[model samples]
Target: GSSGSSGNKVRRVKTIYDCQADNDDELTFIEGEVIIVTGEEDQEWWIGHIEGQPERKGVFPVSFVHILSDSGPSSG
Candidate 1:
């Protein structure tokens, strides 16, 4: 509970598919925007929040992103 938001459970996620922001308020990224998968999900879209823009949270296509590696420390 200390982590605050639930997206921390699925941190380091990245966009695998290109997506555009419709009228649904989903994340509005051109092609490669670092985002983390949120706990909320649906049949069509998966909820997530952007890494750079922490306040940007919305539903994105299920096939739009991929779970990032949890190996060693981040290279960057």
Candidate 2:
């Protein structure tokens, strides 16, 4: 399903986190990849590929994404 943008698509959640982002590890969270983040201070809330955003290279918040969950919601 389409979300808002003509190029956007609605997908299900594959994983769940407090926050997400692409760091030095070269995130695989591409546009087609599923993501979910609750925005918790103790946890990460991001999981989308930073794509061309060079600002978030090789970095991950210590306080963020500390706690991870293998189980994610069906939709996000």
Candidate 3:
């Protein structure tokens, strides 16, 4: 397992809508699920990964999700 850290703070986001990956470089997510965003190089698409799913990093639509804070737990 890789132990090196990139020194970037963890950013989480909750999916606002269900999204299906159109290509191999995209990610699929269901509505209301939280995803870990590792990179945000593009305004429309951002790189993210699902926890417990290794090597599943891919780009997802930024408009499909809402930013989640790292400080507090979200109350439903």
Candidate 4:
């Protein structure tokens, strides 16, 4: 599932550093994994998706990734 506004543009970001899920709600990812950044819920939290792993989806940190493209989330 994609996460973003109805009309507002969603930014596509890529993980630059490896991250482990601190809680069950968070995601564990390796470096170079791309994420679909839907919202900056706050300065620390971000809403997004991870393709293939539905159970791994959740809010993550802003510093976990870098903008990969303005082109938007990649299709499955």
Judging by lDDT against the true structure, name the best candidate.
Answer: 3
Alpha-carbon TM-score of each model against the true structure? 0.62, 0.19, 0.71, 0.67
Least accurate 10 contiguous residues by lDDT in model 3? 1-10
Over the stretch 6-76, how does candidate 2's per-residue lDDT look in tens digits? Answer: 56442124322344444445343322323333232333333332334434433234323233336777988
Q: Rank the candidates by lDDT, best first.
A: 3, 4, 1, 2
**Which 10 successive residues of model 1 have the least lDDT summed?**
5-14
lDDT of 4 by residue, 1-76 (tens): 7856488776677889998888877867889787776656887778788755555677888787887755658896
Model 2 lDDT-worst window of ten: 31-40
TM-score of 2: 0.19
lDDT of 1 by residue, 1-76 (tens): 4758655455456777676788757777655667766665775667777876777888777667666766778777
Encode model 3's per-residue lDDT on 1-76: one tens digit a residue: 6768778486778889998888888887889787787787688878878866746778888888888755757886
lDDT of 2 at 15: 26
* RMSD values, in order shown: 4.5, 12.6, 4.6, 6.2
User: Which of the two candidates, 1 or 3, achieves a greater lDDT against the reference?
Assistant: 3
CA error at residue 8 for candidate 4, angstroms: 3.2
- The collision pairs in model 3 are none
